């Protein structure tokens, strides 16, 4: 249902 968040900034 929800994506794996790969954001790190």
């Amino acid at each position: 249902y929800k994506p794996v968040d790969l954001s790190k900034v």
């Epitope: 929800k2 994506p3 794996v4 790969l6 954001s7 790190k8 900034v9």
Partner: antibody
């Protein structure tokens, strides 16, 4: 000028170690992950995993987990793909690519290395 | 683990005609939070690194010809190439990045009929 340049083609015997490199330039290293992708003979691409230089966070494809290692040198803005002991079946072309690590960005691979042919043979 | 299946596997299309590649996901890659599909299309020409054509399923990459269009949602996606040109000969790949691993479809080989 965004660029990812990989080391040249390499040849090793089975069981030997090998580390190949992906030198990045023209962008902030810490704003992206580096991905490694294997090109299969005939047709196909295998997403092998990604590594973030800011904290060494790695995500490996389950089928390469434990056989390869990723590392980075942020000072050299370079990512590395490692094998501690190669198999003859590790032979193939390996690509590196960049993946946006900024918030709300997608994780498509928008810039790629030229590919490097690793050969493992006796 | 989300897998992608492309159809057809191979394709021979005449110059100036339209080519169509389908991509189907084993799980939806649509996020209602985003209103985005976590999918991309790539073009892989011989002797070249793969090239990104579309991301978020339908956002055209800067510099990609207007002849290319990406559509679809959830599990069902399509790459279309209108008015086929000689330089379109390549393997084409879809990829999801909804969760890890970010798998590619098996690839579709596009041949030009002249």
């Amino acid at each position: 000028q965004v660029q990812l340049v990989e080391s040249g083609p390499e040849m090793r015997k089975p069981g030997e170690s090998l580390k190949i490199s992906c030198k990045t330039s023209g962008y902030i290293f810490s704003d992206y992950w580096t991905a490694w992708v294997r090109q299969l003979p005939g047709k196909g691409l295998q997403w092998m995993g990604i590594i973030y230089s800011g904290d060494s966070d790695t995500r490996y494809h389950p089928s390469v987990q434990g056989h390869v290692t990723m590392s980075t040198d942020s000072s050299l803005t370079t990512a590395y793909l490692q094998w501690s002991s190669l198999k003859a079946s590790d032979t193939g072309i390996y690509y590196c690519a960049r993946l946006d690590a900024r918030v709300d960005a997608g994780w498509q691979l928008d810039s790629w290395g030229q590919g490097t042919l690793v050969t493992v043979s006796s | 683990d989300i897998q992608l299946t492309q159809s057809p596997d191979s394709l021979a299309v005449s110059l100036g005609e339209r080519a169509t590649i389908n991509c189907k996901s084993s799980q939806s890659v649509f996020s209602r939070d985003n209103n985005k599909n976590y999918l991309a299309w790539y073009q892989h020409k011989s002797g070249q690194p793969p090239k990104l054509l579309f991301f978020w399923a339908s956002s055209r990459e800067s510099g990609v010809s207007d002849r290319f269009s990406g559509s679809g949602s959830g599990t069902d996606f399509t790459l279309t190439i209108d008015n086929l040109q000689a330089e379109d000969v390549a393997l084409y790949y879809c990829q999801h990045y909804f969760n890890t691993p970010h798998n590619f479809g098996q690839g579709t080989k596009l041949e030009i009929k002249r």
